[PDB]
């Protein structure tokens, strides 16, 4: 019982250990939702930070190098479960903090661009177009196979900049 007890499934060790390693040199541009990422792994009650340091250790194992988390700058003050991810996050130039779904947009659009996500369509429509849904279940972040149904391309695919 106990909705907060539970969520001490943080127990569960997890280490952000990004391999100092090159990556592969045509993939696109991951643009990551910190907040929605950040929310989902909380169960929509904690703003828990451990759901971005997964995603971006996810990306980062396939090889990915340009990764871009943004969190509003206020997530930096708020509710923050492990904001020691964040820290670690922002001074591996891979967050940078909204001064908000524009900023995805506008950043997906100037790069490759994958959105991780879960009036004015002109913003929301531009992402259906590059949105990468996803699930935790713990630690373990799980993304689908075909990002965009059976008809779509597959993940390898879809992760390229080709």
């Keep these: 019982t106990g909705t ?4 001490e499934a943080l127990q569960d060790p997890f280490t952000l ?15 990551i939702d910190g907040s929605n990422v950040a929310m989902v792994h909380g169960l ?20 990915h190098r340009d990764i871009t988390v943004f969190v509003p ?12 991810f964040l820290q670690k996050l922002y001074s591996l130039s ?3 903090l909204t001064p908000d779904d524009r900023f995805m947009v506008k950043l997906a659009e100037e790069t490759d661009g994958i959105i991780v996500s ?26 689908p196979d ?4 059976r008809n779509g391309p597959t993940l390898d695919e879809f992760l390229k900049k080709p």
């Design 73 to 84: 700058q206020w997530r930096f003050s708020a509710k923050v479960r492990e904001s020691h």
């Design 94 to 96: 891979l967050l940078s």
């Design 44 to 63: 929509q009650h904690y703003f828990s930070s451990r759901g971005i340091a997964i995603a971006v250790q996810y990306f980062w194992d396939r090889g």
């Design 118 to 143: 879960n009036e004015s369509e002109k913003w929301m429509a531009i992402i259906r177009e590059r949105l990468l849904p996803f699930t935790f279940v713990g630690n373990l972040f799980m993304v």
């Design 4 to 7: 907060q007890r539970f969520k």
């Design 146 to 149: 075909d990002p965009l149904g």
């Design 17 to 31: 250990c990004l391999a100092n390693v090159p990556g592969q040199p045509d993939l696109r541009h991951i643009v």
